[PDB]
Each structure stands twice: as C-alpha cells, then as structure tokens.
Design a protein around this ligand. Structure first.
Ligand SMILES: O=C1C=C[C@@H](OC(F)F)C=N1
Ligand SMILES: [Zn+2]
Length: 140
C-alpha cells in the first residue's frame, strides 16, 4: 500500500483505489495502474521533473529502502500477478529488486522528488508507475 500526496491530489495504484477515491476521481488510467483523487488537505510530496534513472524505493515486504537504477518509462509486458492478468503496462520503469503485491504504492524518489510508485514485481524485478510526465499534478 501507499500513495503520493501532492497539492490536493492523492495518487494511488488504480488496483488499490478505494470507493472514496472513485467518488472523488480526478484521472485514472488502467494501462498505467494509476488513479488520482482529490484531497481536502495539501500533501507533503514534490514530484520529480527529470529523466533520472537512479533513485531509492521503499520495499514494505523488507521494511527497507533500496537504492536502484531503473529503466526509462516504457510499454512493458508484465506477467500475471495477484491483482492483474498478464498484460502490457505503459509508463513502467523496471529495476532489479524485491517486490511483492503488497509493496505496491511504495515511493521511488530521486534527487528531484517523487518519481513514481511500486506497481509490479516478480522474477527479481520491481516495476514503478512513473508520474513525472503528469505535469498537471503540480497546479490547480
Ligand atoms: O481481477 C484480477 C485480479 C487478479 C488477476 O490475476 C490473475 F492472474 F489472477 C487478474 N485480475
Ligand atoms: Zn530526478
């Protein structure tokens, strides 16, 4: 589990969105595994605006933050998980690291701020849904 809180937006894995998220929907994209809902209180997070390929992510299944190198966001085939069938997921970054389903929502951060959230795992990789292209998160 986990979210990004930027301005009056809450960014979650689409597959973990709640009824309240869907009832306060701003934007969602199944292909990206992302959903954004509106918040009453302003959030503590700054979104990275950059093309970094190195950062640190939080792994809840290890209670640990790991430094990683990661691929640039791309359209990637993802094997079946507990929460999606095998499918193509867009805007996905991969790193070598540990990820189980419940690790989804852990933040990946670089020197510029929040890069994305854990969205995929298995076979020794961790996949992160990028948010750095979502410039509208920074305003309004
Ligand atoms: O509705 C879902 C939830 C999990 C899933 O995975 C599959 F392989 F079980 C697929 N779709
Ligand atoms: Zn960066």
């Amino acid at each position: 589990s986990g979210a990004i809180y930027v301005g009056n937006y809450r960014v979650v894995n689409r597959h973990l969105a709640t009824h309240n998220d869907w009832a306060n929907l701003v934007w969602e994209d199944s292909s990206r595994d992302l959903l954004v809902s509106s918040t009453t209180a302003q959030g503590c997070d700054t979104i990275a605006r950059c093309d970094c390929q190195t950062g640190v992510y939080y792994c809840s299944s290890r209670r640990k933050h790991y430094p990683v190198s990661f691929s640039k966001p791309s359209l990637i085939f993802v094997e079946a998980s507990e929460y999606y069938p095998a499918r193509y997921q867009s805007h996905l970054m991969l790193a070598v690291g540990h990820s189980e389903p419940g690790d989804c929502g852990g933040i990946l951060r670089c020197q510029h701020g929040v890069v994305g959230i854990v969205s995929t795992g298995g076979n020794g990789l961790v996949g992160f849904a990028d948010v750095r292209d979502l410039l509208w998160l920074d305003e309004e």
